[PDB]
Design a protein around this ligand. Structure first.
Ligand SMILES: CN1C(C)(C)CC(NC(=O)C(=O)Nc2ccc(Cl)c(F)c2)CC1(C)C
Ligand SMILES: *[C@@H]1O[C@H](CO)[C@@H](O)[C@H](O)[C@H]1NC(C)=O
Ligand SMILES: *[C@@H]1O[C@H](CO)[C@@H](O)[C@H](O)[C@H]1NC(C)=O
Ligand SMILES: *[C@@H]1O[C@H](CO)[C@@H](O)[C@H](O)[C@H]1NC(C)=O
Ligand SMILES: *[C@@H]1O[C@H](CO)[C@@H](O)[C@H](O)[C@H]1NC(C)=O
Ligand SMILES: *[C@@H]1O[C@H](CO)[C@@H](O)[C@H](O)[C@H]1NC(C)=O
Ligand SMILES: *[C@@H]1O[C@H](CO)[C@@H](O)[C@H](O)[C@H]1NC(C)=O
Ligand SMILES: *[C@@H]1O[C@H](CO)[C@@H](O)[C@H](O)[C@H]1NC(C)=O
Ligand SMILES: *[C@@H]1O[C@H](CO)[C@@H](O)[C@H](O)[C@H]1NC(C)=O
Ligand SMILES: *[C@@H]1O[C@H](CO)[C@@H](O)[C@H](O)[C@H]1NC(C)=O
Ligand SMILES: *[C@@H]1O[C@H](CO)[C@@H](O)[C@H](O)[C@H]1NC(C)=O
Ligand SMILES: *[C@@H]1O[C@H](CO)[C@@H](O)[C@H](O)[C@H]1NC(C)=O
Length: 339
């Protein structure tokens, strides 16, 4: 017998104590080794309600990632609340590793195994586990990278679809590779991302058909972000310690919905910190080829308001709230206390 509850989680990883890579260094001091023989108990005739949008596991992961970035990625100049911090900004080894979240004694994690589970409401196939699967703390906007895929159909997630102010998470069931490169040797901040247009347009077409099921067969239209900070209007992510900002206008092409799509990107030193600590200037890029190949496994969308009297619904790539990134992986878990 159990009940919904929050508690202090701990983390587990397969980090190497000899690695200089910052995620390894953090997890070495902050996490324990993973369980080689994880146990999972499938419950019968159990109905449990879940709510990915109000899940304390998300806040805790956010706190971990903030801590990790604080100890690892130091900008040359910090501009937080009037005060200005000048400090050293060495180039680091950066590559996210899977982090597992685990409950202490007296608590268990319930896992929803329904194939079409949207993140909220009752779940019929529930199991109890001691730790979540390995989740890479990938910080990005617009596109969710290196995540897990939906096992069956594409899933649409939202706290309230009728509320256009609520972010929509699209969970893909098939990944699409995005290949980003800052050439070696010139504009040292110029870069680009390559995507297979055939693969992407097919997936995007399926996303539209899925959105139709949720919006009463209205016509689905994609548009580039209306405005805001560069972190929102562009697909921003971190590759090898360098902050990439990529223009995704070509990705959401309504006409296409087959060749290589090349997105124009820039490496930026001056960034609005996702932690919410204001603005910061990081160090200039390293020399040589800077390359990251990632799997697109999710999309963050914001729906246009004021379209009730039309047959169209307009969706733009957006987001910015990094907690949503963790929600896209933590949606199927919740903590309960055992009695
Ligand atoms: C709290 N708040 C929210 C989350 C509400 C929105 C917004 N978010 C970002 O500016 C942001 O996420 N930037 C960013 C930076 C680097 C990378 Cl790599 C990236 F992906 C994104 C501003 C702040 C103040 C942080
Ligand atoms: C629930 O999961 C079981 C396997 O654990 C499966 O046999 C069953 O079809 C699932 N029920 C649903 C979601 O229809
Ligand atoms: C998720 O499922 C719940 C319960 O069936 C439902 O109320 C809600 O509308 C669904 N959300 C989405 C995004 O389909
Ligand atoms: C990228 O996607 C492929 C196909 O789903 C997968 O085999 C590979 O492990 C993924 N790489 C990751 C998760 O970084
Ligand atoms: C992804 O989901 C869609 C329905 O949303 C389905 O038609 C398609 O077969 C799925 N793709 C794969 C490879 O399972
Ligand atoms: C969802 O959003 C709509 C529009 O803001 C609102 O009228 C409605 O009350 C919301 N539904 C819930 C369950 O809060
Ligand atoms: C990434 O793109 C570069 C060319 O821009 C290419 O040399 C490399 O093979 C690509 N990587 C993958 C995984 O296709
Ligand atoms: C792009 O993806 C398609 C499958 O959708 C594949 O057949 C084709 O080889 C890919 N293009 C390249 C250049 O790899
Ligand atoms: C969309 O149209 C199909 C016919 O292809 C219909 O069966 C279905 O009920 C419609 N869905 C919605 C949500 O309006
Ligand atoms: C993306 O590129 C298009 C085409 O050049 C341009 O019109 C648009 O302003 C760019 N978006 C951003 C946010 O820079
Ligand atoms: C959308 O695709 C069409 C078809 O090639 C292309 O001509 C156009 O440039 C694209 N629109 C964009 C990315 O603004
Ligand atoms: C995604 O995972 C791949 C394979 O581990 C890695 O090379 C790439 O840098 C990752 N992308 C991001 C943005 O972390």
């Amino acid at each position: 017998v159990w009940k919904d509850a929050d508690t202090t989680l701990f983390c587990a990883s397969d980090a190497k104590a000899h690695e200089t890579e910052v995620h390894n260094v953090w997890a070495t001091h902050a996490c324990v080794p993973t369980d080689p023989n994880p146990q999972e108990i499938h419950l019968e005739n159990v109905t449990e309600n879940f709510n990915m949008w109000k899940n304390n596991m998300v806040e805790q992961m956010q706190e971990d990632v903030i801590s990790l970035w604080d100890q690892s990625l130091q900008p040359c100049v910090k501009l937080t609340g009037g005060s200005v911090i000048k400090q050293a900004c060495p180039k680091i080894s950066f590559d996210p590793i899977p982090i597992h979240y685990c409950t202490p004694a007296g608590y268990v994690i319930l896992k929803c195994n329904d194939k079409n589970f949207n993140g909220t409401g009752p779940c019929k196939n529930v199991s109890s586990v001691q730790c979540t699967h390995g989740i890479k703390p990938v910080v990005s906007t617009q596109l969710l990278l290196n995540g897990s895929l939906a096992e069956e159909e594409i899933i649409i997630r939202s706290e309230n679809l009728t509320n256009n102010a609520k972010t929509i998470i699209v969970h893909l069931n098939k990944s699409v590779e995005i290949n980003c490169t800052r050439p070696s040797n010139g504009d040292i901040r110029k870069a680009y991302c390559e995507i297979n247009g055939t693969k992407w347009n097919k997936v995007l077409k399926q996303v539209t058909e899925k959105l139709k099921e949720h919006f009463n067969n209205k016509t689905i239209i994609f548009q580039p972000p209306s405005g805001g900070d560069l972190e929102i209007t562009m697909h921003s992510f971190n590759c090898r310690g360098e902050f990439f900002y990529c223009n995704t206008t070509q990705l959401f092409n309504n006409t296409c919905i087959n060749g290589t799509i090349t997105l124009p990107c820039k490496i930026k030193q001056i960034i609005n910190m996702w932690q919410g600590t204001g603005q910061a200037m990081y160090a200039p890029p390293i020399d040589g080829k800077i390359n990251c190949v990632s799997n697109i496994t999710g999309i963050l969308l914001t729906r246009d308001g004021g379209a009730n009297n039309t047959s169209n619904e307009t969706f733009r790539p957006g987001g910015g709230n990094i907690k949503d990134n963790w929600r896209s992986e933590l949606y199927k878990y919740k903590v309960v206390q055992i009695e």
